[PDB]
Amino acid sequence: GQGPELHLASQFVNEACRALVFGGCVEKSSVSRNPEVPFESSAYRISASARGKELRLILSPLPGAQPQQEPLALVFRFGMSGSFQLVPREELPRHAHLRFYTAPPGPRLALCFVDIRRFGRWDLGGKWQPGRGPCVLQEYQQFRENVLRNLADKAFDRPICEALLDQRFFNGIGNYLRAEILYRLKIPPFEKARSVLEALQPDLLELCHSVPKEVVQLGGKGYGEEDFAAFRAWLRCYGMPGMSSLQDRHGRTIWFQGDPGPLAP
DNA sequence: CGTCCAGTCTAC
DNA sequence: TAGACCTGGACGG
Numbered sequence: 001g002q003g004p005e006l007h008l009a010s011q012f013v014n015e016a017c018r019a020l021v022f023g024g025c026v027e028k029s030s031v032s033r034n035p036e037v038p039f040e041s042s043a044y045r046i047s048a049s050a051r052g053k054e055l056r057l058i059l060s061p062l063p064g065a066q067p068q069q070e071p072l073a074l075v076f077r078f079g080m081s082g083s084f085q086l087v088p089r090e091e092l093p094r095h096a097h098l099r100f101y102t103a104p105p106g107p108r109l110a111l112c113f114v115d116i117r118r119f120g121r122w123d124l125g126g127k128w129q130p131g132r133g134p135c136v137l138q139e140y141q142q143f144r145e146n147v148l149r150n151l152a153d154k155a156f157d158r159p160i161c162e163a164l165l166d167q168r169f170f171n172g173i174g175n176y177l178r179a180e181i182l183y184r185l186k187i188p189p190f191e192k193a194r195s196v197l198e199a200l201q202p203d204l205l206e207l208c209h210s211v212p213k214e215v216v217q218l219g220g221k222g223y224g225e226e227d228f229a230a231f232r233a234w235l236r237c238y239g240m241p242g243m244s245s246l247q248d249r250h251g252r253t254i255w256f257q258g259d260p261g262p263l264a265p
Numbered sequence: 266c267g268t269c270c271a272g273t274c275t276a277c
Numbered sequence: 278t279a280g281a282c283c284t285g286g287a288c289g290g
Contacts, residue, residue, distance in 0.1 A: 002272095033282095053272080079272055081284080095284080117283040119272060165272080174272075249278080252272085 001078050003137050003172025004215035006050040009084050012223040013048035013057065016086045017111060021062070022046055023103030032097040034122050039072045041065045046100055046111060051128055052135040052171025053077060055084075059100075073126025079119025083222070085112045098122065129167075136172040137216065140209040143171070148201050151194055159263045160196050160204075161189035161254040170208060176238040177215075179255035181207045183237035188261025189246070189254045 001009065022044045026037035041061040049056050059072040076082065085093060089101060089108035096112035097120075113120070134142035147169050150156075155166050164170050164178035173181070182189050184207055187196055196204055218234060220227025237243055238255045245253050246260060 077273075079282090081271085115283095116285070117271090119274095119282065121273085167273085250272095251279085253270090 001053075001082065001221075002174030002177050003050070003052055003135065003212045004177075005083075005221060006053055006055050006078060006172070007137055007212075007216055008219075008221050008223040009078070010048035010050035010055050012086075013046060013055075013084055013111070017046045020045070020109065021103050022059075022100045022111070024101050026059070027099045027101070029095075029097040032118065034097070034120075035124055037072070037074065037098065037122075037124070039069070040067060041069050042067075043103060044069075050135070051138065052132055053167060053174070054128055054132065056126060056128070072124075074122050074124065075126060075128060076113060076122045077120055077129075079115065079117060079121070081114075081116040082120035083114045085114050086110070087112060132167050133169045133171040136170060136208045137212055143208070144205045147197060147205060151197055151201075156192075156194040156197060158193055159190040159248065159261065160187060160193045161256075162248050162250070163193035164208075165248075165250075165252065172212060173208060175252055175254075176235065177208075177212055179238040180236060181211050183243075183255075183257055184211065186257065188259045189248075189256045190261030190263040192263060 023042050025040045028034065028036055039059055043062040043065040045060045047058045047060065055076045057074045061069045087093060087110050089110050092099065092110060093112060093114045095116045096114050098113040100111040102109040133146050136143050155169060156163055161178055161182065164173050164181065181204065185204055187204060202210065218230050221231060237257065243255050243257055244260065245255050246264060248254055
């Protein structure tokens with residue numbers, strides 16, 4: 001997902017796991033090339049926060065849990081198909097690559113990282129990816145300053161539609177969001193990023209926050225079929241009849257209305 | 266049956 | 278910059 005999906009996922013983990021207790025180890029599918037999570041507690045709580053296009057899980061053993069353990073943090077990136085599900089322990093989805101098991105009593109459940117295509121990754125450290133900018137949703141002011149302070153960077157030489165996917169400056173913005181954001185301001189996607197940003201030192205950086213916030217407010221996105229209908233109705237540009245599309249220089253499709261802009265292939 | 270379409274990560 | 282990493286749904290023959 002993009003920032004809204006990662007944020008909604010962290011809300012899902014927090015609400016779903018609020019009154020649950022996990023115990024045991026953290027089980028990884030054999031096909032997953034991500035790392036074994038070395039963690040075991042008889043009793044632990046799982047919580048989450050999102051930052052841009054990453055989600056951090058905290059594994060927090062209860063007072064007296066055994067073996068002795070300090071809380072463990074994991075950072076996840078979802079790639080194209082990452083998600084979290086709470087399922088019954090013996091009805092694991094097909095691509096459940098990492099699982100946390102509730103402890104008794106009550107119905108035995110599993111929190112699963114589900115990633116069909118396996119583009120998602122996790123690391124043990126618990127730290128955000130060095131180089132990712134601040135979260136367009138939760139760190140708006142830091143995000144805004146981080147762009148306006150570094151317009152000399154060669155990243156802003158590129159078309160604006162390309163610059164919007166550079167996670168050093170737009171941590172959380174993905175393909176649908178770049179289309180939806182430029183269509184609201186009818187900024188051509190192949191206008192030069194520095195030209196559109198230089199003129200700011202509600203504008204484009206504000207919509208980098210407010211547009212994703214709109215997606216979050218829809219709620220849901222399986223966090224199931226009706227939630228999906230609401231997102232489809234919300235979209236104005238991405239994939240919509242009457243809209244043009246081109247390939248950016250990395251082969252990713254940009255949707256827009258009218259003028260493609262000066263740097264079009 | 267086939268092609269094509271849907272965010273990093275890394276070797277050239 | 279170009280290809281690599283993957284699976285499943287749509288659609289075309």
